Design a protein around this ligand. Structure first.
Ligand SMILES: *C1(O)O[C@H](CS)[C@@H](CS)O1
Ligand SMILES: *C1(O)O[C@H](CS)[C@@H](CS)O1
Ligand SMILES: [Cl-]
Ligand SMILES: [Cl-]
Ligand SMILES: [Cl-]
Ligand SMILES: [Cl-]
Ligand SMILES: [Cl-]
Ligand SMILES: [Cl-]
Ligand SMILES: [Cl-]
Ligand SMILES: [Cl-]
Ligand SMILES: [Cl-]
Ligand SMILES: [Cl-]
Ligand SMILES: [Cl-]
Ligand SMILES: [Cl-]
Ligand SMILES: [Cl-]
Ligand SMILES: [Cl-]
Lengths: 573, 573
């Protein structure tokens, strides 16, 4: 019977080493074999409601004749073995796909879908080159775990992401108990304590002393905290460089305020020439898909459109798993939620055709410190050689507000920046009030001429839409840790007082700055706990005591010989 | 096989009039018949992800040997017939339960669970007295539709709830299309426009002119707007008076900021003496179960505990549908999230034993207008005969901020009230800063001595926790429409200038006001769009043009002869 299905729980699938992973099978009532969709989940395959609302109404896939297989990753819940993030997922996916392909009910066509870790695991599956894998649909994911979510292109530790997620995994383990241990109850509450105060947990020095998290999940220190360089431990789990050689269609979803946005978008660029790649990007953060934020509402059209996503995924899989050549007729290649106008828009490519990568130069009379300073932005090179200076003190970092925060207040991406506007270490540069709309849609970066009293420090840049009613809404941001200014692999220190030209990768956005608004850029040297604080010493940051850290006198240089600027991807249509 | 199940879609169940409702059957792999759980859904039975995250991980019920039946209510999605809210649900549930009982796979024991309309439909099922119905679990629901969600105990129209929900239903209809109509696309966008600006749609006068909503769903005007009195049209769909005669166990869930809280709690009180009733109340609003709000965080323990709820429901159904007499061992009768201390607490009853219903009297030197006026609250009767006066103008009502809002900004219950503190029509009365904690847990009401220049007006009261850092956090509130001061059924007007003692039902809360905080009460004459605005005319409010409405000079009397006060349910433990 069309539309009917059955569910078999805890089918045990042997891996190459004989460890058995548990799966649930959702199989249509069908005469013969069917196309199959695989989901690889570290958050309990039984708990479908917790992730699916961020993905698709996938029971529709089953009612329409696909089988769906949901798997507990190694070492968690009903699965055997030992859990360590990322390291086993290439091999376990390969072995799982091989098993699926062998079954009576599989017709030789497999796809995958899912969000976050359920998205990352799809890139790890894709690189095995198993012929039966015909398509993936990674949502809010990354193919390079150093670049997202654990560090970033600027080489700073994403400390709130790490502690937040580790506490979540830890709480899952205390749930996914052999048998309840005496310490379980207390551990559970203490993990809650981290989740209730992520900046507080990230504030302890040395950062690398984690007696609760490092005990429950040694990987937190052993892999992440201990490897600040993008070294071979990172490069062993990175898929990115293998993506260029694949020919696997990918339906890629991202969010403008999602921790993974930079890396999600980069995977689209990496696969689009070799296979049918699709891109959808909404104004969401990782835990807030609603379109509603404390000080910014995008409208009900911005709410994660779960049914439309379901229809699109089905069209995508119908094309690639069922040979329906016309299934994606009229489906755009790229679909973006353009903020400001707050509308969904179809595009033919990402980056957009006719992107004008336009410098807006940092300028102004007198100090740019605070929102009431003299800092300006202009498409004209600044006429005189100035410099703005501030003191960056690790004991008082600029607090994170919105952006791509994951666990520490990660539900307010377009946050109003006014609470940090009166701070002396936040340099502000804004345009005149606009009389014509300016659409900025694309990747964003800054080039700054900088100097420090210290042998290492950070520089941050944050793009902001200043509204007429006073709201100063965060759009995108990034950081450069100075030791990593040229390379994330082979860092070197800087000379005090020497001027450097550095690049700041500020990820991507889509916003129309409307008449009446200003384009604003904040420059500082911290953004905590989104990123861990630079000690200003050149030492091993995570091993340092706060008391041992230094303040730094940091300087932004601007003028005709040091044309510091933000590069904005300008669209005129 | 234990843990395995099958799903049959669109099984068509004949009602007494021969109209067929569609159901999906989730049935365990079982030798013989099983206990059955029924869910009656107006939001598409296929779309399980949209409501279930507000309820239970109910697939666990199926893996553990219960069948689950999810039904499309009459006239929606796969069901035949014509949709009108509430009126068919008693009979359709009765007929559906009878059909379930007849099936090979039903062992004679039926229960129900679900949230909101999926909760209301359970009270409508319960009153049929079908013997096989052994238990219900209504979450965030009501047994009296006039009292929640459409009007309230104060006799004012809950206008944002009505327009918001009607627009949602309307959008569902445009989805649940015979075949797409030419006007569908535009209607859809215009319904979005209501949802994006609920106060704006509620602002149009006459309110009863609704060319889009009244066309899509005539009931909006025909039933709701047209019947402001709690008349026989309302009393035909009310279950409340029949609840006292039932002996059906009910697992009742509510939220402190949920539109249905007053009525959810009242159903517990109505059934607790005749059957095993259970109560769980968290700090949630109808669309925000996260425990996170713009200016108030309750901690991760406050996040709707979906797995714990699942375990409790299973224990409850194991007791009542499977005869497991010891299944609820160690399960509290009442479990409340106590705000302020922000902790879950077990109780033996609701109302709590040893509740001291304590008057806090309105007092102070000089005018109580604004937060910086002289208004005070005290357990001592005020010594001199004063009065506070303001002008209530319908064209400028006090905006709704937090509370039990449903669709207009209904995701911020504990809203900071500071944005309306400088208004002249908001009278404020606060205690001294507390040196000892004060726990207020129970139903809350006010008694005010009032007078008006008008022959009808409203009075509002709102309980507020003022934090040391300035936050003034809304807790509970209510309204009295003066014509309904004595009765919701037979209203009469008031004489201008004459003093009346009125009761304001402020629903319920659980909060510890901690040392350093103040207890604060706001008094006004509007709370829009939570409630529609009184025209101050004595006319038919929903039929009046704004231009035809009057301002009113309203007066709150306080002192030894007019001891206006709030009654707080004080707990000392
Ligand atoms: C997703 O499930 O949430 C996490 C945010 S850090 C991430 C881990 S790769 O995947
Ligand atoms: C629930 O499903 O949401 C509505 C809020 S007004 C309500 C209608 S009775 O049920
Ligand atoms: Cl089988
Ligand atoms: Cl293992
Ligand atoms: Cl262990
Ligand atoms: Cl907005
Ligand atoms: Cl749109
Ligand atoms: Cl100098
Ligand atoms: Cl130089
Ligand atoms: Cl059958
Ligand atoms: Cl009908
Ligand atoms: Cl019609
Ligand atoms: Cl708080
Ligand atoms: Cl608690
Ligand atoms: Cl007078
Ligand atoms: Cl009198």
């Amino acid at each position: 019977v069309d539309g009917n299905y059955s569910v078999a729980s805890n089918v045990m699938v042997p891996m190459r080493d004989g460890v058995r992973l548990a799966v649930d099978l959702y199989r249509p009532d069908a005469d013969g074999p069917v196309p199959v969709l695989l989901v690889r989940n570290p958050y309990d395959k039984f708990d479908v409601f917790a992730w699916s609302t961020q993905s698709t109404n996938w029971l529709e896939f089953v009612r329409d004749g696909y089988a769906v297989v949901i798997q507990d990753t190694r070492g968690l819940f009903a699965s055997e073995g030992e859990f360590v993030p990322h390291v086993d997922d290439e091999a376990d996916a390969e072995d799982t796909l091989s098993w699926i392909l062998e079954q009576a009910w599989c017709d030789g066509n497999v796809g995958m879908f899912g969000v976050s870790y359920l998205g990352v695991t799809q890139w790890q599956a894709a690189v095995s080159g198993v012929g039966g894998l015909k398509a993936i649909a990674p949502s809010m994911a990354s193919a390079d775990l150093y670049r997202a979510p654990w560090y970033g292109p600027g080489g700073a530790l994403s400390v709130e992401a790490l502690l937040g997620w580790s506490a979540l995994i830890g709480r899952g383990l205390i749930t996914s108990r052999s048998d309840a241990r005496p310490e379980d109850a207390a551990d559970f509450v203490q993990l809650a304590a981290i989740l209730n105060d992520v900046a507080g947990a990230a504030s302890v020095t040395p950062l690398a002393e984690q007696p609760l998290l490092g005990r429950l999940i040694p990987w937190v220190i052993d892999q992440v905290v201990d490897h600040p360089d993008n070294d071979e431990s990172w490069q062993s789990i990175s898929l990115f460089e293998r993506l260029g050689g694949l020919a696997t269609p990918a339906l890629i979803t991202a969010g403008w305020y999602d921790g993974f946005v930079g890396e999600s978008l980069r995977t689209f660029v990496a696969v689009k020439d070799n296979a049918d790649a699709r891109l959808v990007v909404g104004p969401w953060s990782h835990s807030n898909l609603t379109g509603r934020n404390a000080d910014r509402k995008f409208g009900i059209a911005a709410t994660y459109p779960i049914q439309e996503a379901t229809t699109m995924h089905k069209a995508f899989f119908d094309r690639h798993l069922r040979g329906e050549t016309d299934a994606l007729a009229g489906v755009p290649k790229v679909r973006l939620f353009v903020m400001g106008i707050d509308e969904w828009r179809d595009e033919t490519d990402w980056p957009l055709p006719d992107t004008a990568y336009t410098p807006f130069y940092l300028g102004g009379s007198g100090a740019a410190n605070t929102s009431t300073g003299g800092g300006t932005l202009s498409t004209s090179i600044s006429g005189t050689e100035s410099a703005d200076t501030y003191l960056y003190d690790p004991a008082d970092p600029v607090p994170s507000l919105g952006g791509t925060l994951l666990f520490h207040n990660g539900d307010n991406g377009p946050a109003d920046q006014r609470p940090i506007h009166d701070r002396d270490d936040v340099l502000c540069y804004s345009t005149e009030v606009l009389t014509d709309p300016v659409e900025v849609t694309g990747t964003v970066s800054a080039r700054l001429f900088v100097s420090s009293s210290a042998v290492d420090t950070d520089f941050t840049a944050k793009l902001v839409d200043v509204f007429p009613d006073g709201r100063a809404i965060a759009l995108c941001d990034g950081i450069v840790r100075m030791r990593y200014r040229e390379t994330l692999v082979n860092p070197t220190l800087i000379e005090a007082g020497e001027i450097y030209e550095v690049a700041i990768d500020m990820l991507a956005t889509s916003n129309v700055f409307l008449p009446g608004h200003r384009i604003m850029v904040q420059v500082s040297s911290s953004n905590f706990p989104k990123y861990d604080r630079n000690s200003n010493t050149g030492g091993v940051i995570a091993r340092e005591q706060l008391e041992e850290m230094c303040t730094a006198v940091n300087r932004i240089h601007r003028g005709p010989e040091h044309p510091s600027h933000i590069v904005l991807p300008i669209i005129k249509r």
